[PDB]
Amino acid sequence: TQTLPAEGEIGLIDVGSLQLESGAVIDDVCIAVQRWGKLSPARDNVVVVLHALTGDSHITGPAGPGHPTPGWWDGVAGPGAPIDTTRWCAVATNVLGGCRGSTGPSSLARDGKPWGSRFPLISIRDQVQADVAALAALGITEVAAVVGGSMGGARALEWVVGYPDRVRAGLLLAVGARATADQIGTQTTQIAAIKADPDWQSGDYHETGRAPDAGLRLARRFAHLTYRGEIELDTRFANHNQGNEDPTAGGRYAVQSYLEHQGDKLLSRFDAGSYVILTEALNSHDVGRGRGGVSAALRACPVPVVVGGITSDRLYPLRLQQELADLLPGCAGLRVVESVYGHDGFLVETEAVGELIRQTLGLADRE
Amino acid sequence: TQTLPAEGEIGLIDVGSLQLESGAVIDDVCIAVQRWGKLSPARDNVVVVLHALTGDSHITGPAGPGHPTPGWWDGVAGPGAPIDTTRWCAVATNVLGGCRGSTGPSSLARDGKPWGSRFPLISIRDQVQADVAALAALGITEVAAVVGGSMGGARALEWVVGYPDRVRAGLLLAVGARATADQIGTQTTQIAAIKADPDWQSGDYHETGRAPDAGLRLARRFAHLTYRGEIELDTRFANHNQGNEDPTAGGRYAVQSYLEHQGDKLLSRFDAGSYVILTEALNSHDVGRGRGGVSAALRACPVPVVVGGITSDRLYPLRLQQELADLLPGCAGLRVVESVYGHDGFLVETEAVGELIRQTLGLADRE
Ligand SMILES: N[C@@H](CCO)C(=O)O
Ligand SMILES: N[C@@H](CCO)C(=O)O
């Protein structure tokens, strides 16, 4: 009924009313979409690439109009790429709750004011329901494969587990069956830092001329450290000063200065309200809720999957991927991606991760 | 010339004018002190116990008047204990910059107003001058052993390296030769959260009936996570809710609630200004500064030392202890403490760490 945008261009997909897991019903849902490669005549070659916490639909490509920075996974989709677009059609949504096209706290409700504090808490499962609805509105009812890391891997997991009849294979990268105590710990506190900012104004700051920037920068600095590998950070920055500043007289250390920059980079492209809603959705992640626990749910999922984890990951430790490999019968065994870059390793080790993308897409073609 | 307090009792030791590494001078410095076990006639059996970031002079004993909670290393010193007070004199200060007896931002400056924003930045090396000044004020000019973990291990490494002829052995536990990028990263951001609180008031909140409690609570919650082990936390809390609260309708998870209490516990006994000043001193930690670098400094230190590190420590990883073991000729080899409790492991694994305390005092006997 509706059509994929032209390659590279964004389209907004009207999915209508959506009933969340909470029972609430959200009106006028809109999901931003982008694609690379041609949609095959059977519409059976879609590879959904699922972004992480602050990502959007712009997975690959250079900076341009409407896109201040290159794709967050630059190079993963294209001619000859791991997601080879001469044979596959890489589709990437902007997740429900986001702030780059899709319906989120920053978006305008049917009363003309921004959703703000009225946006309901949503789950990873809601986010997967929204994407499936959107692919439906475009006439795509089965996907060849899902690929994702971090939150995107959580989306991938809930996709393959909840819709096994409508996905042929999955690649789950640096993710676990549920939220860990440590993740919830850092993540709930990140939310607290934003909410403690006085300009938070209960989440209804949009269009007031004040925003919770101090809190959002705090959240991003602490979060960024979880994404890194301890040694690599020490090797890059150590206890060196930033340029010619002296910390003993109020200047900054190099790693400190860097973290500040990471926060400014986020402020110029991201909305505090979405940071809260999506982190809440991370906290609630649990593939076993309502289906007998993690083991029961995974043991029942027959979808073939490739599971990869990073050796140096401090936020989603390898043990969590081993658990997924252990429990999912469609998984041949854990694939260990060797990397010094911690959680961000799955975006950095392009060759090692490419192999997993190829094996994952190979499995979608066997069926 | 001044008196050792009674066993258990706090005493306040006037050390007078103290000149910091910056050249600045603080007048009327006071170091709170406590001791357990009897001081020998030669005054040669002192075992200095150095507390970590939030610690005080109350290393052992139960809660009582002036001590709302038992000592931070309850049990480490006593008859037959690792620090055997029938033979050793266990002395513990409150570090310069603290808020439990010694001169810190919360202390009253000579003008009758709190030091506050006027308290100067200090180093681990400064903290050691003040401790050495206090013991001198008591007629103690040489210690037998220095024992510490975390910030107290940096106080013990700067003591063994800077006062090499006035200490006979050292126990360096869960510490490194300098601050790591990761440590500086989390720690500067913790300071940033305190300073972003509106009630911080440039550090001069002390007599204004409002204080930066939200920021100090944010700092402690993030810090607390670094002291824990990822697995034990997940085993303890998982993604369980707190009691009967529903996070999907505004409730808290069990770990989230736990972290909230950790912050409440700190507020009722600790000063935000000291948190800031003391974290600065942590960032400035660098045993090689002014001595030609870490290797040069350690290679030149002949003091017998024991070095222990915790396998699961996420704030001061085992690699940092291996470096100390590698470089100090007085170290026979890294002693690895097996523990699932992360950084807090050195206070928990009482037999394993106590075993090492005995080894250190054993070395002080030999010498
Ligand atoms: N892309 C998300 C997750 C990164 O691992 C973010 O930047 O926060
Ligand atoms: N918990 C200690 C740090 C080392 O565990 C303190 O803050 O005093």
Swiss-Prot record, chains A, B:
EC numbers, comma separated: 2.3.1.31
This protein's record includes keyword Transferase: yes
InterPro entries: AB_hydrolase_1, AB_hydrolase_fold, HAT_MetX-like
Pathway: Amino-acid biosynthesis; L-methionine biosynthesis via de novo pathway; O-acetyl-L-homoserine from L-homoserine: step 1/1
GO biological process: methionine biosynthetic process
Catalytic activity: L-homoserine + acetyl-CoA = O-acetyl-L-homoserine + CoA
Binding residues annotated for substrate, in chain numbering: R220, D344
GO cellular component terms listed in the entry, alphabetical order: cytoplasm; plasma membrane
Subunit (UniProt): Homodimer.
Protein name: Homoserine O-acetyltransferase
Organism for this UniProt entry: Mycobacterium tuberculosis (strain ATCC 25618 / H37Rv)
